[PDB]
């Protein structure tokens, strides 16, 4: 079956593991441990089709980023998530997107936007600012919460349809 390799990229605490482990475990993750470099598989139908997630879920840290660049490479699609409470975790999705362009060796890498922590009222990050931010990087903009689990299917999900444009 088509196996789809995705990778989930941001800044420390942003809230990359508590999604993937919503979707993978249904559960929310409460506490923070960082993590080095983890990964997860699961069997789902996605549009009828029956595949494969691969997830590789990266350090934010800088103290744990060692060779996150390796892991990186054979990703075939990136969810780059910032925290709509966090502003410089906002500004600094460009750099993570650079990364990817970088380890790629492409300027048309298979992404989607994604503002966590959407259950929050402490919000730093407008709509709009991301909105915008994605249409110049020609991807999609979803807001998630890892804790609700609103649109953390839809952020996954929306990925293998990027996926699947390229
Ligand atoms: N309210 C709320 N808290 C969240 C949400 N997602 C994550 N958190 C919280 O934010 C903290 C960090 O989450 P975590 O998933 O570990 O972040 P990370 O991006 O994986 N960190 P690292 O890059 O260091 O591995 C945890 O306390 C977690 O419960 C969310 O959608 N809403
Ligand atoms: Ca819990
Ligand atoms: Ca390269
Ligand atoms: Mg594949
Ligand atoms: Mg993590
Ligand atoms: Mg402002």
Same mark, same amino acid.
């Given at each position: 079956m088509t196996?789809?390799?995705?990778? *989930? *990229?941001?800044?420390?605490? *942003?809230?990359?593991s508590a999604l993937t482990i919503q979707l993978i475990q249904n559960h929310? *993750? !409460?506490?923070?441990?960082?993590? =080095?470099?983890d990964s997860y598989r699961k069997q789902v139908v996605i549009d009828g089709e029956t595949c494969l997630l691969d997830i590789l879920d990266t350090?934010?840290?800088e103290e744990y980023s060692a060779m996150r660049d390796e892991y990186m490479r054979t990703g075939e699609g990136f969810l780059c998530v910032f925290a709509i409470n966090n502003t410089k975790?906002?500004? !600094? =999705?460009?750099?993570?997107?650079?990364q990817i362009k970088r380890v790629k060796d492409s300027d048309d890498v298979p992404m989607v936007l994604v503002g966590n922590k959407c259950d929050l009222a402490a919000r730093t990050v407008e709509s709009r600012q991301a909105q915008d931010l994605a249409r110049s990087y020609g991807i999609p903009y979803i807001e998630t919460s890892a804790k609700t689990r609103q649109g953390v299917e839809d952020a996954f999900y929306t990925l293998v349809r990027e996926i699947r444009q390229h």
């Open positions: 196996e789809y390799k995705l990778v *989930v *990229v941001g800044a420390g605490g *942003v809230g990359k929310f *993750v !409460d506490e923070y441990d960082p993590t =080095i470099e350090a934010g840290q975790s906002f500004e !600094d =999705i460009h750099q993570y997107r650079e």
